């Protein structure tokens, strides 16, 4: 016998969506009230932070979860999208590793665009 098998890999085209050096707006204007660090501690709530995501979230509690997986469970209907995303947040007041959620995207209801050219 043998111990290797199973395997799979596929993505798409994405290098970046133009912009230029340095940045012309840190994800980090301000965000939140963002008061802790050897000045205000109050708890061992997570504090406003950002990974991977430019996008920062507000200040939390531990133990909690800032998931936001679609905005209804409707199946088949016109969503909102309000910043879908998945990110726990542990009982010792951090967050997790980095935002995710692609079990929002894939849905049993979408199928448009192709386009196409022909001689």
Same mark, same amino acid.
């Given at each position: 016998?043998?111990?290797? *098998? ?13 912009? &230029?050096?340095?940045?012309? /707006? ?44 679609? &905005? ?5 209907? *016109?969503?909102? /999208? ?11 007041? /951090? ?10 995207? &894939?849905?049993?209801?979408? *199928? ?8």
């Amino acid at each position: 016998g043998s111990g290797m *098998k199973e395997t799979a890999a596929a993505k798409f085209e994405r290098q970046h969506m133009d912009s &230029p050096d340095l940045g012309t /707006t840190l994800l980090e204007q301000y965000c939140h009230r963002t008061t802790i660090g050897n000045f205000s501690g109050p708890y061992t709530y997570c504090n406003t932070t950002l990974d991977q995501i430019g996008t920062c979230w507000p200040q939390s509690a531990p133990g909690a979860l800032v998931e936001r997986p679609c &905005p209804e469970y409707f199946n088949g209907i *016109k969503y909102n /999208t309000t910043r879908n995303a998945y990110r726990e947040c542990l009982e010792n007041g /951090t967050w997790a590793s980095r935002v995710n959620y692609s079990h929002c995207e &894939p849905i049993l209801d979408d *199928k448009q665009r192709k386009y196409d050219l022909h001689y």
